[PDB]
Structures are given as C-alpha cells and as structure tokens.
Amino acid sequence: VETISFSFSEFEPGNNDLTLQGAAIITQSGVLQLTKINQNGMPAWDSTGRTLYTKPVHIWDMTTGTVASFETRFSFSIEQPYTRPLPADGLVFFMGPTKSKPAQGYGYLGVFNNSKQDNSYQTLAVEFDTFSNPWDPPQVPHIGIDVNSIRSIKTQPFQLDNGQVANVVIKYDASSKILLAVLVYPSSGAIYTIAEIVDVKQVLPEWVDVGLSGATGAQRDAAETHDVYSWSFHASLPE
Amino acid sequence: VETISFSFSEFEPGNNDLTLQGAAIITQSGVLQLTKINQNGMPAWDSTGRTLYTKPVHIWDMTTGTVASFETRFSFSIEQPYTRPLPADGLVFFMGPTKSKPAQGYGYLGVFNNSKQDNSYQTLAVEFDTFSNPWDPPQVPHIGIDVNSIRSIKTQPFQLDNGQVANVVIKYDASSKILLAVLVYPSSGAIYTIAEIVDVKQVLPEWVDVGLSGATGAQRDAAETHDVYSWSFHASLPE
Ligand SMILES: [Ca+2]
Ligand SMILES: [Ca+2]
Ligand SMILES: [Mn+2]
Ligand SMILES: [Mn+2]
C-alpha cells in the first residue's frame, strides 16, 4: 500500500512542503490568506491565489487498475464586509494535473478557464461558492462537487456565518466511488452534507497535485476574505 | 410529490405523535431515555427501549418505481459509568416494516433477532455501537450502516465523549443510492463520517416506520445511558 499524508495545524511561512501561487500569502500568525487583504485590512477585489502541496499524490494505477481512497480536512473563514456589491467568488479544494498553474479567476475560482465540461481538465474539486454565476443554482453560498467543470454535478446551499470558522471534511472511498463533503460551523452548530458518485479513474490522471484556491470579484469591492487556518490530507493506494 | 416531516426540538410526555415501546420513557425535562434509568440515577442493564413515529412513511412505489430521498437528524448522549464490566450495547436509528415491535435486545439493539443477513428483516439502520460482539469490528464505539443485518456492511470507529451531546445527521439521496451518516461532538469539535451505497427498493417495503432504539447489556452493570434530546425527519417521494 502506497500512502502519503500531511497535517498543518497552522500554516508555516517558509515551509517548502507548500507552494504559494498568485496572491496567496501565509501570515506570521500562521493563517493562509488565499486572496489579498489590503493595507486597511480589507479584502481586495480582482484577486486570485492558491497553495499546492509540493509533493504529488499517486491517486490510481493504470497497470494494476487500483484506486486510492482519500480524505482531507481544513478550517476556513469567509468575511463579507460590504452589503453591496454582492460578494464573490469563493474558495475551493481541488485535485488535478501536477505542477498546474492558476487558471481564470472570478467565478472560475482559479481552477477552471471557462464554464464547459471538459475531460482535458482532469480535475476534481469541492467548492464553497459565494457568488451566483449564470451556471450556478440561485442559492448562495453553496457547496458544490465539481467534476471537470465549474458547473457542479451537485450542489448544497448553506448559510454563511460571517467571519466564523467553518470545519470541512471531504472523503472519497474508491470501492463505493462515493465522494462526500461536510461543513460544520462550531459557532452555530450548523451541519451541511453533500455527496455524489465519482469515478476518479475516469477523471484524474494517475498522479495529481492537491491544493486550495480562492478568488474575489470582477468589479470594485466585490470581495471577501478566503482565509484557511489548517489543512490535513491522507491517501491510501492499495496494491 | 408525497412528502412527510416532523421535528421535535425536544420531547414531551403525552404527545401521541411518538409511540414508546419497551423501557423508553420521556422525562418531565423533555429527554427521551431509551433505556431504563434506575432510581439511584444510574443506567440499568438488561434494558431495551425504542420510540417509533406514529405515522408510516411512503419510501417507494412499486407501480411507478419512484424512490424517496430522505434525511433525519437527532442529538443523543451516552454515559458509561463503570470501568468494568464493559459498557454495552448501543443505540440506533432504523427504518423497517410498520406494525413492528421491539426485537431482541443486547447486541441486537432491539432491531434484529440474530446475526444473520435476512432479507425478511426489510430493515435499514444506522447504529452507534458501544460493545464489540463476535460479528463486530474490534473498535467501539463505532458507527455502522446495517442492511437487513446487525453485521454492518460498513463501520466507522469514533471516540465517545462521555456524557456529552452528539449531533447526528443521516441523509439518503435516492438518485445516487448514497446513504450518508455524520456525527459531530460540539464539545470537542470532533467530526466522523461514513457512507455507502444502498438501494432501498431492494431492502425496504413500500411503507415503513422510522424510529430509534437503545439497549443495555446482558450482565449486571453492563450498561450506559441512551438519551435523545431531539429528533427531526423528512422524506420526499417523487411524483
Ligand atoms: Ca459562482
Ligand atoms: Ca455490538
Ligand atoms: Mn457554484
Ligand atoms: Mn456493530
């Protein structure tokens, strides 16, 4: 069995096990700010940032046909400072081709480049979407499972507890092909769940990079914070 | 669309929407004690109790072939007073034939009668097992998905936070056939998940009763509390 795992109780500036991209920044206090926070302490619009675990994950083996099961956990906070314009756009956990570069920002969360379902993306993602784009359900924010597209194969609305820390748990069981996500707000006790069938073997390449990405809006002040406090990951590939 | 739903933010003695069976009683304080609490304030062994919702639920329709999606949530607490003998046995949420009475207690949790996988049980359930019987995984407590058998088709160990309140969320999406269960301990922030594929049409009858059940051990002082503070349920049958 081939296994890989990491756990950051807090983010460490300078730890090479994590690559920062775009506006992404790790504060001295240990917080990962995916989208730029201005001098005045407020989230900047037109911003996109990501972080990738430096080491690639062996998610499945073509020769043997085996597929790994995995789980990732992280705590994050989103603070929407203005009543208008609407806030945007969200953050997301993603898995895809190794050594990828940030894609289009805004509603594409830095992971996609358009709103088409393309197998060439070879990406699987769990989003926490804050702005309703033409391809989105009307309810916002919402959790969404993305398979080779920003257009979720399934979504689940949830209420944002402004500035409060949300605990997220994502798990994929290769035998049942079930990918599930759970979001918990310890502040209010609220619990949300979403799940769907996903055959990673039909989506992702054998080796992938796992990461987090966030993006703020296209017009002035259509922004919000996309801070992450901790991130753990584990994958087990049977032989 | 055929929909049904109920929500007890608390329990009240006398409310006839809930049928109490065996040792289960609703205290003046509004707490549902599935298993007998003696006069000295401790849990009695050799006790089995359950509560059923008075009205049946239309889970699926043979003629049209339509299948209902549902979700249920509840809060419970288990207190294990002694170091020895081991505590036992657990509580569980179940869906099965209407007009049912409590089955065997102990490790069968008042829902099954043996350790066989019999289609005649026509029962689906999510247990929170505190004792490890011969058919169980070695770790207890554990969550488990039961399909016509006390021998779970899938289990998930978890740590008990003694006497603390656990928040449970169980959801079933018929289109994906996914059955998910989540447990959250507000006290510690701990989150546990478990999911599996279940085709209710191959398991349950068209109409079912939904309920909760708890049981204590077969030997003196092999017991624990099985209190439920709240319970909600909702189902929706397409067309
Ligand atoms: Ca969006
Ligand atoms: Ca047991
Ligand atoms: Mn979306
Ligand atoms: Mn068990």
Break-preceding residues in chain B (C–N over 2.5 Å): none
Bridge partners of residue A33, in order along the sequence: A25, A227
Q: Which residues of A are annotated as a binding site?
A: 127, 129, 131, 133, 136, 142
DSSP string, B119-171: GGG--EEEEEE-S--TTS-SSSSEEEEEESSSS-SEEEE----TTPPEEEEEE
With CA atoms as reference, the chain B residue closest to A75 would be B189
Look up the domain containing A237 and give its range: 1-239
Experimental technique of record: X-ray
B213 with B111: CB under 8 angstroms? yes
DSSP string, chain B: -EEEEEEESS--TT-TTEEEEET-EE-TTS-EESS-B-TTSSBPSS-EEEEEESS-EE-B-TTT--B-EEEEEEEEE-----SSS---EEEEEEEE-SS------GGGTTT-SSSS--GGG--EEEEEE-S--TTS-SSSSEEEEEESSSS-SEEEE----TTPPEEEEEEEETTTTEEEEEEE-TTT--EEEEEEE--HHHHS-SEEEEEEEEEE-SSTT-----EEEEEEEEEEE--
Say how many CB pairs under 8 Å bridge A and B.
Answer: 49
Which residue in A27, A49, A18 sits closest to A36, CA to CA? A49
Domain count within chain B: 1
In angstroms and rounded to an integer, the radius of gyration of the C-alpha atoms of chain B is 17
Phi, psi for residue A121 in degrees, rounded to 5: -70, -35
Contact B167 A189 (CB under 8 A): yes
Closest CB to B176 among A184, A186, A196: A196
Q: Which ligand is nearest to the CA of A88?
A: 1
Angle at A27 between CA A224 and CA A215, to 5 degrees: 30
**Which residues in chain A are closer than 8 Å to B173, comparing Cβ atoms?**
195
What's the reported resolution, in angstroms, to a tenth?
A: 2.1
User: SS3 for chain A, per residue?
Assistant: CEEEEEEECCCCCCCCCEEEEECCEECCCCCEECCCECCCCCECCCCEEEEEECCCEECECCCCCCECEEEEEEEEECCCCCCCCCCCEEEEEEEECCCCCCCCCHHHCCCCCCCCCCHHHCCEEEEEECCCCCCCCCCCCEEEEEECCCCCCEEEECCCCCCCEEEEEEEEECCCCEEEEEEEECCCCEEEEEEEECCHHHHCCCEEEEEEEEEECCCCCCCCCCEEEEEEEEEEECC
Separation in Å, CA of B190 to nearest CA in chain A:
10
A111 with A211: CB under 8 angstroms? no
Closest CB to A167 among B167, B178, B189: B189
B190 in contact with chain A, both atoms CB, cutoff 8 A: no
CA dist., res. B133 & res. B130, Å (int): 10
Long-range contacts of A59-64 (CB under 8 A, 24+ apart): A59/A95, A59/A200, A59/A204, A59/A205, A59/A206, A59/A207, A59/A208, A59/A235, A59/A237, A60/A200, A60/A201, A60/A204, A60/A206, A60/A237, A61/A206, A61/A237, A62/A206, A64/A239
Q: Which of B:54-73 have CB within 8 Å of A?
A: 73
Domain of residue A123, CATH code: 2.60.120.200
**Which residues in chain B are closer than 8 Å to A75, comparing Cβ atoms?**
none
**Which residues in chain B are closer than 8 Å to A178, comparing Cβ atoms?**
178, 195-197
Bridge partners of residue B51, in order along the sequence: B20, B212
A32 by Cβ neighbours in 10 Å (0-12 / 13-18 / 19+) ranks as buried
Closest CB to B184 among A73, A180, A191: A191
**Which residues in chain B are closer than 8 Å to A180, comparing Cβ atoms?**
178, 180, 193, 195
Q: Which residues of B are annotated as a binding site for Ca(2+)?
A: 129, 131, 133, 136
CA dist., res. A236 & res. A171, Å (int): 12
